[model samples]
Target chain A: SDYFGELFLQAMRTGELAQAQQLMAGAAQLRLKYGDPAGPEAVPEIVRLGRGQLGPQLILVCPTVMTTGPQVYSRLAEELDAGRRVSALVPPGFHGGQALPATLTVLVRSLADVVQAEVADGEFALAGHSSGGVVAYEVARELEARGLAPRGVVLIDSYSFDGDGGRPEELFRSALNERFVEYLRLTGGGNLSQRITAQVWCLELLRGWRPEGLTAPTLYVRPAQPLVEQEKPEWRGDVLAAMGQVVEAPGDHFTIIEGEHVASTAHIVGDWLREAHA
Target chain B: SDYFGELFLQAMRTGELAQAQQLMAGAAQLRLKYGEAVPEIVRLGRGQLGPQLILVCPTVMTTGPQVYSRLAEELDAGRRVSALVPPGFHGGQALPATLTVLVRSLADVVQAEVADGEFALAGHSSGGVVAYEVARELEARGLAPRGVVLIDSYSFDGDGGRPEELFRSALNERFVEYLRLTGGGNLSQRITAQVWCLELLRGWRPEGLTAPTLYVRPAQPLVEQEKPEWRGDVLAAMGQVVEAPGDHFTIIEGEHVASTAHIVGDWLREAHA
Candidate 1:
């Protein structure tokens, strides 16, 4: 939980007290704002991508790591031609120096609480990318359970199955390695260990939980092709139907949320949002 | 347990009754025989444009390179591809001392062929686990491949409870399919030992794979016995995943081989590029 301490020690060991001081000051401000890293009151930041006056607020969720931060939704936010407010859920941990949630339920409730505080009786929609889609689906359900039903939902190539045959240690290592690889590919900066720990923890939580059907209008935006051969079409159809309406985006899973295709994704989701919420 | 039920079910789905009859008859004689023989590294294609060598591992209990024949042919002009026939899949020999020993032997064989050049590995079905281990071994020796590819392979441990029963049934089903694919080449004993080898991997779960990997999933399952909603997030967390046409067996044979090769070939090209 002490990202500052971790980085600060490294800086001190190298005699970079200047770097240590900068980290210390930033850490203090963050603690003052978000509460102690391990404190119960700590909450994820709700990043506002855009302020639209007329439509329901749209909340974006990343696949646990939030490595790319809310900027992963930058293009989608820009492409939503409708004057809808767009914000993204930046879960505590990573650069924010907050402790990871103890369980998927806690994460969901914390996220819902933050959103609840911001929107407060205002209409909002939820959308998630990859495993983030799993998070968005649950948050929608959680909101509904709390008498704050979402107007619509969008899952961008996200899926979940109903079993846990994977070993915990192996899954954690796999998530950590993938997080490391992604950080290398991204060349973007943050506390690398914090990101890795956060991603691994999030995956653990995801593995332990399952999603149920929601009453909110929903759309699952899938890629034109799959990432693996074992994913049968009939099975995919069945899983997607339970979640919401299914639509085929132009690119593969990861690509659908990137580059030129993200605009296409936004268009699909925006159109569906209009249809479902209008 | 009921051959009639199994064969009739396959026949109904495929409408290849005559083929089914031949397979069932072959399976009967094959079952009487629980005994085996193996392959080291059989090159299936020649390098033309692409320099990277792709090592292929067929499904568990599947001997020779027959399953990968069409895939090799499909990639012939573009890149070199080969299939590793693990020891004891032929020649009626005893299986390897352990799966680790088998993987190490294959690693040695792979290292020799690669010989200071770029190479990648591909495994279909249970061979996916073998390929994954071999990649990890190579990485430890600092000879990491351009990548590894898993073809319709399950990476976790969901098929719980009795490993023997599930392993034996899956072997029987796969062996019959192998005979149909290879025209039943007097492989009874080989099937026996291969089944023994599969039991070695019963509780295996992959860990420590850092190589860029690709998982190619077939569009359909061989039967309903296997879960239809299988996801590769375990592997996907390590690398990318794509789909190909056909069931697990068909993915490497006939018309579907072209699609499988297309996706694999494209990925290899990028991996080595």
Candidate 2:
């Protein structure tokens, strides 16, 4: 119901879909530059899609299917407007690959490189969702291990266990699950089977991993309505003690990441970041 | 060194040279079966022969230069025996999402290493895929390798329609083998890279591969299969087969490693011989 809204409609007409996607990317970056004209749905209190580099702090995001759209953290990044470069560690083979140590090595290296390059003059923070949280924690662990600690980490209802693996086909059962499938269809080589195989291999690789103890400042965005707190706390023992604090995020495992919820969560974590860094 | 190794024999004869090389490769397997044999033949660590030959390893080999060691020695000293490491954190430089860019860049690395030498490439599993592309890139650059070697890699053979056909139609079973290969880093990173490398390679198809290829294949597939690797038709067309010692990884190491090395060395020599 806005001017840009109609423009979006017109862009989707006929052969202009590519233009729409590219436009969306620019829109996100613009949001980071300007204020979120969309709505108060994201962060309310203490929410400032900062214009100037208030703290000269960079925020490195791990790849969360929800956090990153079109395989980048553009959605969250646009809303982040954190007054610094907000980047996501998009791994290669996102379309397909094997679950090997080679995967971890690539991420650790990317984090190390990107943090050094972008966070040059500012403190840095980390945010990750679902699987991304595992990555977020791992990167933080590697940094702490090497003494290049981040200011804090934000883990949103992410799993840190290394148990059984789900086949990629099983994982990609939904429209959201088949996100890459949809993405691949956009490309010419849309082989459902190969993509599925690649996805399966990648998904299964997520299992059989152990969580490293996170030593940096931390904030756990626990869903007020968790999927099922089968355990006392997903993060327990050493992992539990390391957290600076735990914050309640409204909604269940899935709902907590919805529109306004994610916005609120971002603000809550934003405040936590300020306190942790302070 | 055996003085009879080659002199007048340096140029090499017909059936005899091929027979001798295959015999040496077999001899390596036999010797390995026996024991260390001579303590002096320590088989030197990851020493590259020289600029005349090169080996390209898959990105997954987190360890140092391996998979094709002594085989490298048999063909080395004066020849360049560098290994092409795929772009990732295992030790190689990273690349963007662009496939051809990285594929060509891989050739860039291999080309730079084999600078002005008789270009030869070999890889185990995924490395073979990268080697296949790099060979194509080299040919595009008019610096085609003497030959390319593929060791049980399916990059040339598109993962196919069923995708499950990769391990032959059943993913549950493939997942079983996946857990074993997914070592080195934590699970998250593997996912990230898995997603990434898959993207880097998805659009990639081995087209116009001019360099003659010597596919040193294993007898068994990574998953449950009939012809070792469930390869597609094009690989059969692009590559000539040389039955290596064992399965994927073992064909590059173990007692069979000697045979693998010898066969590879023999193929390389044919390019220059």
Candidate 3:
């Protein structure tokens, strides 16, 4: 792990590269370890699950940043019944010379291949809590473009950050970087991956490319205490409404993954998919 | 297995109960073993397809009666399954020019089959088209089924204008085929078949069927060369469309029956859940 994973993201957002190479050194290691396109698997992944009785229905998960994804989704995987199997997408490095969009383009490719292999013509659903929503939507669009449509998608309190760029990164950077890095320290231990810095730019580059054709039904999970609130709600456009039904989750975005909220989130999304298909 | 289950038709047509009863006895045993409320294979044609036809894969026509057994044994167990014991079967004459009457009769067949609680209805063309009417009739009578699946059938555009000579020829061919062989040439072997379906679908109108409907659409066409989609608002909910494999017939035939079964079964399970 890059010792400066979360801190590296901070240095980038503050418009300086104080610990850039230390972050960059680990980024190269991460690039070799996880992000190397020529490498086998060449993708960051938490886990893939498929032992369900309904072997047909597949779930893809993008978890919280700073690699809290593995921790968060492992808990989620337990809550899901044997009838459901879930996959967790791990994060990639951030200091690569390629811009955030370029990095994401590669990321989408890796994710799309895995998603395509796991699903049949019409058998997949996606979910993301916290910062993972940025990654989930991009993966979904990638799959959509590849002529593979999922059954549904769940956005858990992270749909607000979904956009097609143009927001001031600095305005969100100061507030988000602090909470996320600390969130990582408590959850992620060990050295961080510089891939995290790229993730920050990704949150900035979240694109709601609502492509035409067979789009999956969507379920929006709102938390009790949403962290990111803005004065202009209209500009963000209700991504959930654009997709499908919108429902409230148990606690704040963070709590939704912990305590009793994860169970509630799991149950609601499960019920939504059961009703949406067929 | 039957030279395609067509071997025994002549025995039934010969008007003797011995061979017919041998076959009928097996049908009866199947009916009891599965705990069926009625003879599930309500063969309504002079031509017959039993055991072999009964245990095969999904087909546009014969497969439904066969599905009854697996479903009886497999789907939640001891559940309802029945074939339409339409007139012109059991040594009866086929009903004529009475589309509404036949639908009520089909509803009558369904009533005894899945008599309790709610049931899911599925049918092809007039089967689905007629099943829509049957669902409405049952619902109006306080027996609302849970859901209706509109299999690729254009009952909304009820174009039953085929020449009477053609209809007569088809039935005559079926009647002669009936003499080919069945079990016993008895009353039970005289069920209706394909030609009369043309009569029942003639000039029929489908309106106000508000069940939770599912449409299993054909990717190619209803036929390889014809049956472009019905092109109208057929169901109230219109529910969802599960694209079955191939152009209409293939889904019920080769390389696709299991896939079709998977698609339909999954939908039903999800709908029930």
Candidate 2 structure quality by residue, lDDT tens digits, B139-200: 87878577878776654234345343344223223322344464333322222233355435
**Whole-model lDDT, candidate 2?**
0.50
* DockQ of each model vs. true complex: 0.01, 0.01, 0.00
Across A65-122, the per-residue lDDT of candidate 3 in tens digits comes to: 4444455566566666456667766554432333222355666676677667767675
Task: Summarize candidate 1's per-residue lDDT along A48-70 as a digit string, tens digits.
Answer: 88856567888887677536477
Q: Model 2: DockQ against the native?
A: 0.01
Judging by lDDT, tell me the better candidate of 1 and 3: 1
How well is each residue in B189-234 modelled by candidate 1, as lDDT tens digits? 4444554556566656667687788888888765545542234344
Highest TM-score, which number? 1
Judge candidate 1 against the unseen true structure and give its global Cα lDDT, from 0 to 1. 0.65
**Which window of ten consecutive residues has the lowest lDDT sum in model 1 chain A?**
A24-33
- Which segments of candidate 3 are over 4 A away from where they belong? A1-41, A49-54, A94-103, A120-122, A160-175, A193-195, A207-214, A228-235, B1-273
Cα lDDT listed for each candidate: 0.65, 0.50, 0.50
